[PDB]
Amino acid sequence: AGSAGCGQPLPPSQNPGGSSYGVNFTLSAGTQRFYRIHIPSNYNVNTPTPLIFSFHGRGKTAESQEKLSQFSNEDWNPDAIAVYPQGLNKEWQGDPHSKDVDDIAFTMEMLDYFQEKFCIDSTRVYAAGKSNGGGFTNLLACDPTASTRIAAFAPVSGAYYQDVSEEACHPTTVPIKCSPGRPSIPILEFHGTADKTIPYGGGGRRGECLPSIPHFVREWSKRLGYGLHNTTKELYDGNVQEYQYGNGDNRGIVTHYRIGGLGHDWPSVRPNSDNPNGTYLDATPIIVKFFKQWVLPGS
């Protein structure tokens, strides 16, 4: 359904296309937050419009995450409003350093604002993120309320920190704290095998515990009721494996791209702020296609 903002003109300072706008936004409980919003050039106030949240890595900004993730590039994302929120202290809820910052409330209040002021398709609200932002994407998927409002989730090199000491950290078996509020949560996860910051194999980090990425992906396939069975595809001369979980009916509802030799990088063929060399594929068009595949079901 199109939101309450359908028929409302854009804020007086905004018009479609061009550069993203920086906006200060004060949450109900009084914390002033910040986001950048990119309005697609084809925006129409009467047309229910999809929306993508894109969350930066630790130590990064909304501005750098816009350039990194390319959701404002209309060659790759012609139709969706792109929103780049700023994390307090350049980090997100879920990081070992983040204390009593409710970024889930920030995201839910932002979405309520966008529904009020824009023509939002509430069946096509999405979240993606790099590293700490990818961890935060997973926390939205794992939140009883946020999981029912956001259609699909694309953590890239995400940091799924569990409150377990390095010494007690068993990355293949560590419980992953998660309470999705509906079945069939769509998860698209990209990870490099040579990631030193958020290792593919997980393990102790900064005093806490990261799961292995296969464990992360398997717990998503399992908790949604689809067991451990995958299909595998070889891509780019076998340098990339694509794993798709689900049955014949929902094949891919959980998908993982394993990128051989890739470090802690948003995948791009061209150089980006993360990686000067480029890799085999662009993650962003795959994410946009995944979002298109998986809308929020009625009820």
Ligand SMILES: *[C@@H]1O[C@H](CO)[C@@H](O)[C@H](O)[C@H]1NC(C)=O
């Ligand atoms: C947002 O709020 C901060 C804090 O007062 C201010 O310095 C900044 O210029 C404001 N930015 C915008 C875009 O309104």
Ligand SMILES: *[C@@H]1O[C@H](CO)[C@@H](O)[C@H](O)[C@H]1NC(C)=O
């Ligand atoms: C997919 O299944 C095969 C066994 O069929 C397994 O060896 C592989 O590790 C699985 N992929 C992931 C990401 O767990």
Ligand SMILES: *[C@@H]1O[C@H](CO)[C@@H](O)[C@H](O)[C@H]1NC(C)=O
């Ligand atoms: C990028 O490629 C260069 C060679 O052109 C290589 O020496 C370097 O280690 C690569 N990776 C990074 C992260 O700079």
Ligand SMILES: [K+]
């Ligand atoms: K390259």
